[PDB]
mmCIF file of C-alpha atoms in Angstrom:
data_model
loop_
_atom_site.group_PDB
_atom_site.id
_atom_site.type_symbol
_atom_site.label_atom_id
_atom_site.label_comp_id
_atom_site.label_asym_id
_atom_site.label_seq_id
_atom_site.Cartn_x
_atom_site.Cartn_y
_atom_site.Cartn_z
ATOM 1 C CA UNK U 43 108.205 105.923 115.215
ATOM 2 C CA UNK U 44 108.524 104.327 111.776
ATOM 3 C CA UNK U 45 108.275 100.776 113.140
ATOM 4 C CA UNK U 46 104.998 101.718 114.834
ATOM 5 C CA UNK U 47 103.638 103.134 111.570
ATOM 6 C CA UNK U 48 104.568 99.993 109.617
ATOM 7 C CA UNK U 49 102.923 97.841 112.298
ATOM 8 C CA UNK U 50 99.798 100.005 112.019
ATOM 9 C CA UNK U 51 99.732 99.260 108.285
ATOM 10 C CA UNK U 52 100.025 95.523 108.936
ATOM 11 C CA UNK U 53 96.942 95.658 111.159
ATOM 12 C CA UNK U 54 95.060 97.858 108.673
ATOM 13 C CA UNK U 55 95.607 95.445 105.770
ATOM 14 C CA UNK U 56 95.810 92.164 107.755
ATOM 15 C CA UNK U 57 99.221 91.824 106.172
ATOM 16 C CA UNK U 58 102.869 91.075 106.726
ATOM 17 C CA UNK U 59 105.016 93.973 105.505
ATOM 18 C CA UNK U 60 108.728 94.071 104.753
ATOM 19 C CA UNK U 61 110.744 97.197 103.984
ATOM 20 C CA UNK U 62 114.406 97.865 103.285
ATOM 21 C CA UNK U 63 116.202 101.038 102.224
ATOM 22 C CA UNK U 64 120.019 100.669 102.223
ATOM 23 C CA UNK U 65 122.069 103.197 104.154
ATOM 24 C CA UNK U 66 123.572 106.162 102.303
ATOM 25 C CA UNK U 67 126.083 108.862 103.170
ATOM 26 C CA UNK U 68 123.703 110.585 105.588
ATOM 27 C CA UNK U 69 120.710 108.240 106.052
ATOM 28 C CA UNK U 70 120.660 105.093 108.142
ATOM 29 C CA UNK U 71 119.143 101.971 106.659
ATOM 30 C CA UNK U 72 115.374 101.722 106.977
ATOM 31 C CA UNK U 73 114.457 98.163 107.912
ATOM 32 C CA UNK U 74 111.207 96.459 108.888
ATOM 33 C CA UNK U 75 111.073 92.654 108.749
ATOM 34 C CA UNK U 76 113.873 93.209 106.246
ATOM 35 C CA UNK U 77 115.502 89.783 106.724
ATOM 36 C CA UNK U 78 112.259 87.796 106.607
ATOM 37 C CA UNK U 79 111.612 85.833 103.436
ATOM 38 C CA UNK U 80 108.910 86.945 101.000
ATOM 39 C CA UNK U 81 108.088 85.467 97.606
ATOM 40 C CA UNK U 82 109.868 87.183 94.702
ATOM 41 C CA UNK U 83 106.794 87.046 92.555
ATOM 42 C CA UNK U 84 107.530 89.058 89.420
ATOM 43 C CA UNK U 85 110.235 91.208 91.039
ATOM 44 C CA UNK U 86 112.720 88.541 89.892
ATOM 45 C CA UNK U 87 112.187 89.659 86.286
ATOM 46 C CA UNK U 88 114.413 92.722 86.829
ATOM 47 C CA UNK U 89 117.541 90.764 87.884
ATOM 48 C CA UNK U 90 116.591 88.150 85.270
ATOM 49 C CA UNK U 91 116.983 90.739 82.513
ATOM 50 C CA UNK U 92 120.252 91.836 84.117
ATOM 51 C CA UNK U 93 121.451 88.221 84.016
ATOM 52 C CA UNK U 94 120.612 87.861 80.319
ATOM 53 C CA UNK U 95 122.218 91.218 79.508
ATOM 54 C CA UNK U 96 125.396 90.342 81.412
ATOM 55 C CA UNK U 97 125.670 86.890 79.825
ATOM 56 C CA UNK U 98 125.589 87.981 76.177
ATOM 57 C CA UNK U 99 126.849 90.612 73.739
ATOM 58 C CA UNK U 100 124.476 93.519 73.426
ATOM 59 C CA UNK U 101 123.498 92.452 69.899
ATOM 60 C CA UNK U 102 121.965 89.310 71.442
ATOM 61 C CA UNK U 103 118.989 91.635 71.992
ATOM 62 C CA UNK U 104 118.223 91.260 68.278
ATOM 63 C CA UNK U 105 117.952 87.445 68.322
ATOM 64 C CA UNK U 106 114.424 86.303 67.441
ATOM 65 C CA UNK U 107 112.750 83.827 69.813
ATOM 66 C CA UNK U 108 109.815 81.758 68.569
ATOM 67 C CA UNK U 109 107.206 80.174 70.820
ATOM 68 C CA UNK U 110 103.781 78.593 70.544
ATOM 69 C CA UNK U 111 100.399 78.113 72.210
ATOM 70 C CA UNK U 112 101.606 75.792 74.975
ATOM 71 C CA UNK U 113 104.182 78.394 76.098
ATOM 72 C CA UNK U 114 101.486 80.852 77.267
ATOM 73 C CA UNK U 115 100.916 79.560 80.806
ATOM 74 C CA UNK U 116 100.755 82.782 82.857
ATOM 75 C CA UNK U 117 99.839 86.461 82.663
ATOM 76 C CA UNK U 118 101.596 87.528 79.453
ATOM 77 C CA UNK U 119 100.106 90.762 78.077
ATOM 78 C CA UNK U 120 102.694 91.187 75.307
ATOM 79 C CA UNK U 121 103.733 87.644 74.397
ATOM 80 C CA UNK U 122 100.101 86.644 73.799
ATOM 81 C CA UNK U 123 99.971 89.290 71.044
ATOM 82 C CA UNK U 124 103.211 88.377 69.257
ATOM 83 C CA UNK U 125 102.905 84.584 69.402
ATOM 84 C CA UNK U 126 102.276 84.493 65.643
ATOM 85 C CA UNK U 127 105.574 86.262 64.826
ATOM 86 C CA UNK U 128 107.982 85.646 67.713
ATOM 87 C CA UNK U 129 109.801 88.193 69.848
ATOM 88 C CA UNK U 130 113.411 89.277 70.032
ATOM 89 C CA UNK U 131 115.352 88.988 73.280
ATOM 90 C CA UNK U 132 115.113 92.772 73.561
ATOM 91 C CA UNK U 133 111.337 92.666 73.152
ATOM 92 C CA UNK U 134 111.191 89.904 75.770
ATOM 93 C CA UNK U 135 113.254 91.940 78.246
ATOM 94 C CA UNK U 136 110.994 94.934 77.614
ATOM 95 C CA UNK U 137 107.800 92.948 78.190
ATOM 96 C CA UNK U 138 109.140 91.089 81.229
ATOM 97 C CA UNK U 139 109.940 94.352 83.023
ATOM 98 C CA UNK U 140 107.320 96.778 81.723
ATOM 99 C CA UNK U 141 104.273 94.464 81.576
ATOM 100 C CA UNK U 142 105.513 91.739 83.962
ATOM 101 C CA UNK U 143 105.108 89.280 81.098
ATOM 102 C CA UNK U 144 105.390 85.729 82.425
ATOM 103 C CA UNK U 145 105.946 83.988 79.110
ATOM 104 C CA UNK U 146 108.710 86.472 78.327
ATOM 105 C CA UNK U 147 110.302 85.658 81.682
ATOM 106 C CA UNK U 148 110.078 81.908 81.051
ATOM 107 C CA UNK U 149 111.690 82.333 77.631
ATOM 108 C CA UNK U 150 114.442 84.482 79.142
ATOM 109 C CA UNK U 151 115.076 81.818 81.785
ATOM 110 C CA UNK U 152 115.406 79.254 78.992
ATOM 111 C CA UNK U 153 117.803 81.602 77.189
ATOM 112 C CA UNK U 154 119.968 81.667 80.318
ATOM 113 C CA UNK U 155 119.801 77.882 80.166
ATOM 114 C CA UNK U 156 121.018 75.167 82.461
ATOM 115 C CA UNK U 157 119.250 73.042 85.063
ATOM 116 C CA UNK U 158 115.777 73.953 86.236
ATOM 117 C CA UNK U 159 114.848 75.632 82.968
ATOM 118 C CA UNK U 160 117.259 78.429 83.857
ATOM 119 C CA UNK U 161 116.297 78.917 87.509
ATOM 120 C CA UNK U 162 119.617 77.522 88.751
ATOM 121 C CA UNK U 163 121.573 79.931 86.537
ATOM 122 C CA UNK U 164 119.368 82.806 87.685
ATOM 123 C CA UNK U 165 120.147 81.924 91.300
ATOM 124 C CA UNK U 166 123.829 81.654 90.396
ATOM 125 C CA UNK U 167 123.724 85.170 88.992
ATOM 126 C CA UNK U 168 122.408 86.448 92.322
ATOM 127 C CA UNK U 169 125.144 84.517 94.138
ATOM 128 C CA UNK U 170 127.739 86.305 91.987
ATOM 129 C CA UNK U 171 126.361 89.590 93.367
ATOM 130 C CA UNK U 172 126.912 88.358 96.933
ATOM 131 C CA UNK U 173 123.270 87.378 97.553
ATOM 132 C CA UNK U 174 123.436 84.158 99.595
ATOM 133 C CA UNK U 175 119.749 84.368 100.611
ATOM 134 C CA UNK U 176 117.527 84.444 97.526
ATOM 135 C CA UNK U 177 116.527 81.380 95.535
ATOM 136 C CA UNK U 178 114.454 80.741 92.421
ATOM 137 C CA UNK U 179 113.083 77.212 92.111
ATOM 138 C CA UNK U 180 110.165 77.390 89.653
ATOM 139 C CA UNK U 181 109.191 79.467 86.653
ATOM 140 C CA UNK U 182 105.858 81.087 85.847
ATOM 141 C CA UNK U 183 103.114 80.505 86.979
ATOM 142 C CA UNK U 184 104.217 78.261 89.839
ATOM 143 C CA UNK U 185 106.665 80.701 91.451
ATOM 144 C CA UNK U 186 103.750 82.829 92.753
ATOM 145 C CA UNK U 187 102.065 79.894 94.505
ATOM 146 C CA UNK U 188 104.354 78.570 97.245
ATOM 147 C CA UNK U 189 102.647 78.333 100.648
ATOM 148 C CA UNK U 190 103.409 81.097 103.153
ATOM 149 C CA UNK U 191 106.642 80.333 104.983
ATOM 150 C CA UNK U 192 107.981 78.069 102.229
ATOM 151 C CA UNK U 193 111.471 79.187 101.229
ATOM 152 C CA UNK U 194 111.150 78.229 97.555
ATOM 153 C CA UNK U 195 111.120 81.236 95.218
ATOM 154 C CA UNK U 196 111.876 83.737 98.005
ATOM 155 C CA UNK U 197 114.087 86.726 98.638
ATOM 156 C CA UNK U 198 114.136 89.293 101.450
ATOM 157 C CA UNK U 199 113.691 93.074 101.309
ATOM 158 C CA UNK U 200 117.317 93.377 102.424
ATOM 159 C CA UNK U 201 118.689 90.932 99.847
ATOM 160 C CA UNK U 202 116.809 92.208 96.803
ATOM 161 C CA UNK U 203 117.566 95.840 97.664
ATOM 162 C CA UNK U 204 121.306 95.164 97.712
ATOM 163 C CA UNK U 205 121.037 93.314 94.396
ATOM 164 C CA UNK U 206 119.105 96.154 92.778
ATOM 165 C CA UNK U 207 121.587 98.686 94.172
ATOM 166 C CA UNK U 208 124.460 96.926 92.400
ATOM 167 C CA UNK U 209 122.528 96.574 89.142
ATOM 168 C CA UNK U 210 121.315 100.174 88.792
ATOM 169 C CA UNK U 211 123.691 102.262 90.925
ATOM 170 C CA UNK U 212 126.792 100.058 91.129
ATOM 171 C CA UNK U 213 129.009 98.345 88.574
ATOM 172 C CA UNK U 214 127.399 94.909 88.231
ATOM 173 C CA UNK U 215 126.667 95.793 84.594
ATOM 174 C CA UNK U 216 128.699 97.817 82.101
ATOM 175 C CA UNK U 217 127.209 101.272 81.491
ATOM 176 C CA UNK U 218 125.403 100.442 78.234
ATOM 177 C CA UNK U 219 123.656 97.379 79.692
ATOM 178 C CA UNK U 220 123.003 99.255 82.945
ATOM 179 C CA UNK U 221 121.228 101.965 80.950
ATOM 180 C CA UNK U 222 119.001 99.448 79.143
ATOM 181 C CA UNK U 223 117.897 97.914 82.440
ATOM 182 C CA UNK U 224 117.357 101.325 84.043
ATOM 183 C CA UNK U 225 115.332 102.649 81.102
ATOM 184 C CA UNK U 226 113.029 99.610 81.017
ATOM 185 C CA UNK U 227 112.341 99.972 84.743
ATOM 186 C CA UNK U 228 111.828 103.722 84.250
ATOM 187 C CA UNK U 229 109.103 102.964 81.676
ATOM 188 C CA UNK U 230 107.352 100.308 83.764
ATOM 189 C CA UNK U 231 103.567 100.372 83.311
ATOM 190 C CA UNK U 232 102.531 98.338 86.381
ATOM 191 C CA UNK U 233 103.815 100.379 89.335
ATOM 192 C CA UNK U 234 101.829 103.632 89.436
ATOM 193 C CA UNK U 235 99.934 102.687 92.620
ATOM 194 C CA UNK U 236 102.895 101.303 94.616
ATOM 195 C CA UNK U 237 106.202 103.009 95.483
ATOM 196 C CA UNK U 238 105.594 105.690 92.824
ATOM 197 C CA UNK U 239 102.412 106.697 94.661
ATOM 198 C CA UNK U 240 104.354 107.426 97.858
ATOM 199 C CA UNK U 241 106.990 109.747 96.420
ATOM 200 C CA UNK U 242 106.483 113.363 95.281
ATOM 201 C CA UNK U 243 106.240 113.952 91.546
ATOM 202 C CA UNK U 244 109.626 115.693 91.367
ATOM 203 C CA UNK U 245 111.331 112.467 92.500
ATOM 204 C CA UNK U 246 112.314 110.075 89.713
ATOM 205 C CA UNK U 247 111.113 106.498 90.236
ATOM 206 C CA UNK U 248 111.990 103.306 88.360
ATOM 207 C CA UNK U 249 110.548 100.027 89.581
ATOM 208 C CA UNK U 250 109.558 96.404 89.074
ATOM 209 C CA UNK U 251 106.411 95.082 90.725
ATOM 210 C CA UNK U 252 105.431 91.625 91.870
ATOM 211 C CA UNK U 253 101.970 90.202 92.559
ATOM 212 C CA UNK U 254 101.067 86.679 93.571
ATOM 213 C CA UNK U 255 98.748 84.434 95.526
ATOM 214 C CA UNK U 256 98.155 84.715 99.272
ATOM 215 C CA UNK U 257 97.696 88.448 98.740
ATOM 216 C CA UNK U 258 101.307 88.975 97.686
ATOM 217 C CA UNK U 259 102.217 92.480 96.519
ATOM 218 C CA UNK U 260 105.811 93.660 96.083
ATOM 219 C CA UNK U 261 107.633 96.584 94.540
ATOM 220 C CA UNK U 262 111.361 97.231 94.189
ATOM 221 C CA UNK U 263 112.522 100.640 93.057
ATOM 222 C CA UNK U 264 115.333 103.091 92.707
ATOM 223 C CA UNK U 265 114.315 106.681 93.405
ATOM 224 C CA UNK U 266 116.225 109.926 92.860
ATOM 225 C CA UNK U 267 115.618 113.118 94.815
ATOM 226 C CA UNK U 268 115.119 116.419 92.960
ATOM 227 C CA UNK U 269 118.881 117.002 93.394
ATOM 228 C CA UNK U 270 119.858 113.580 92.045
ATOM 229 C CA UNK U 271 120.523 111.677 95.291
ATOM 230 C CA UNK U 272 119.515 108.010 94.794
ATOM 231 C CA UNK U 273 117.908 105.571 97.203
ATOM 232 C CA UNK U 274 116.886 101.933 96.766
ATOM 233 C CA UNK U 275 113.456 100.966 98.121
ATOM 234 C CA UNK U 276 112.210 97.391 98.528
ATOM 235 C CA UNK U 277 108.680 96.825 99.824
ATOM 236 C CA UNK U 278 107.203 93.328 100.083
ATOM 237 C CA UNK U 279 103.921 92.110 101.511
ATOM 238 C CA UNK U 280 101.545 89.188 101.815
ATOM 239 C CA UNK U 281 98.154 88.524 103.405
ATOM 240 C CA UNK U 282 98.477 84.851 104.302
ATOM 241 C CA UNK U 283 95.598 85.178 106.766
ATOM 242 C CA UNK U 284 93.211 85.355 103.820
ATOM 243 C CA UNK U 285 94.427 82.146 102.231
ATOM 244 C CA UNK U 286 95.405 81.486 98.638
ATOM 245 C CA UNK U 287 92.740 83.827 97.228
ATOM 246 C CA UNK U 288 93.548 86.784 99.493
ATOM 247 C CA UNK U 289 93.436 89.999 97.489
ATOM 248 C CA UNK U 290 96.750 91.835 97.025
ATOM 249 C CA UNK U 291 96.510 95.351 98.431
ATOM 250 C CA UNK U 292 98.591 97.906 96.530
ATOM 251 C CA UNK U 293 97.593 100.690 98.916
ATOM 252 C CA UNK U 294 99.667 98.997 101.617
ATOM 253 C CA UNK U 295 102.771 99.576 99.500
ATOM 254 C CA UNK U 296 101.787 103.145 98.601
ATOM 255 C CA UNK U 297 101.321 103.999 102.282
ATOM 256 C CA UNK U 298 104.573 102.305 103.305
ATOM 257 C CA UNK U 299 106.385 104.200 100.552
ATOM 258 C CA UNK U 300 104.812 107.462 101.737
ATOM 259 C CA UNK U 301 106.317 106.781 105.169
ATOM 260 C CA UNK U 302 109.714 106.113 103.594
ATOM 261 C CA UNK U 303 109.534 109.231 101.423
ATOM 262 C CA UNK U 304 108.841 111.340 104.505
ATOM 263 C CA UNK U 305 112.090 110.123 106.060
ATOM 264 C CA UNK U 306 114.182 110.592 102.910
ATOM 265 C CA UNK U 307 112.826 114.058 102.032
#
């Protein structure tokens, strides 16, 4: 059945695969290695934006943040362009989600504040959503680099799916902040070959990707059927057998998502 198909994918890509889809009214949870830890990688940037939105009035989005050359320490497609003028919190949220901008994420962590450059407050935000599993310990670029099996900077497919469910479908955020988060994920530019690739075109998909060392490739999404029925989909993977420089393999996530879509159709 579905477990056999996911195991086939692990052998095909020399990978470890984790999948979680929470249960709904009529569908049982889909779970494969769903309680094993995988690195967040950039998937943490979605709940990070939620944390910053929740913490501040909505007009905080218009506050200008300045930064300089020594702040660009990671893949930062937007922040590298605006370094000469600064970026507002809103622009930083946009870039962190839609371009997985690492400098934007680091600046948003600092905006959250507190110990660990904001990582402790980020973890505390997850705890307030009932997530007792996930932990963020470093910022960019280091959070992509922990050795396989190390629990620093990890979540699980199960844990991050339940967090995303509350943020997008539940009441963790007031409606106006919920809509900002949802719209940024809906306009993501980095996810076309992951969960989006597994679902038919008449399904709506919003997502946040993650990519890291040891062949790490993640995607977390909310999808809506053509009749508006929502599902949360978390897919996580690594290829530790190839070492630090193992290539991430997006097609693994597209195939896993195709399997999931077949069950939810």
